[PDB]
């Protein structure tokens, strides 16, 4: 599997409850739920860069698959986690060890769709991105 490309959000399902479960305050939940970030991904051997890009902010994950790293979620839910991203067959599985139980995500591809399930405390948010070709800085 190769996740490299540029991807545009098509749906974002149950995002509000996900953020509610991270204890994000009601006003930021409103701001956050309006954002439709693109995903720019470069898979370079086991080195993955995943840029979640929006006007409100860019969130950059830059990691080595299988190697735990310290993830600074300040500005999201104001936490830090020790995160590990691992291959689970054709799926990318992330566990974010920290204050919240069961926090992570799973990413996979179906045709020209990038699929992203985000999880915390038994709450699930599902996003789907379509692969696009128009790139502007
Ligand atoms: C492979 O992608 C992994 C994903 C898993 C989820 N995190 C955290 C997350 N931030 C957000 C949004 C967000 C949530 C809360 C506060 C501010 C922003 C967001 C939107 C646009 C750019 C950056 C962030 N929504 O979710 C981002 C990377």
- The set of protein residues with a Cβ atom below 6 angstroms from ligand 1 is 19, 24, 28, 32, 35, 37, 50, 52, 54, 56-57, 59, 76, 105, 107, 116, 118
Which method, experimentally, gave rise to this model? X-ray
Count of domains in the chain? Answer: 1
- CATH no. for residue 119? 2.40.128.20
Domain span holding position 49? 5-129
In a domain, 67, yes or no: yes
3-state SS of the chain is CCCCEEEEEEEEECHHHHHHHCCCCHHHHHHHHHCCCEEEEEEECCEEEEEEECCCCCEEEEEECCCCEEEECCCCCCCEEEEEEEEECCEEEEEEECCCCCCEEEEEEECCEEEEEEEECCEEEEEEEEEECCCCC
- Ligand 1 centroid to Cα of residue 59, in Å, is 7
Q: Per the domain annotation, does 87 fall within a domain?
A: yes
């Amino acid at each position: 599997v190769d996740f490299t490309g540029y991807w545009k959000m098509l749906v974002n399902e149950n995002f509000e409850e996900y953020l509610r479960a991270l204890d994000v305050n009601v006003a930021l939940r409103k701001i956050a739920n309006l954002l439709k970030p693109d995903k720019e991904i470069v898979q370079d051997g086991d080195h993955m860069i995943i840029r979640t890009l929006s006007t409100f902010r860019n969130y950059i994950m830059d990691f080595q698959v299988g190697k735990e790293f310290e993830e600074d979620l300040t500005g999201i839910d104001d936490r830090k986690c020790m995160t590990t991203v691992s291959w689970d067959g054709d799926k990318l599985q992330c566990v974010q060890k920290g204050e919240k139980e069961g926090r992570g995500w799973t990413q996979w591809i179906e045709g020209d769709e990038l699929h992203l399930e985000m999880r915390v405390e038994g709450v699930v948010c599902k996003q789907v991105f379509k692969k696009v070709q128009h790139h502007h800085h």
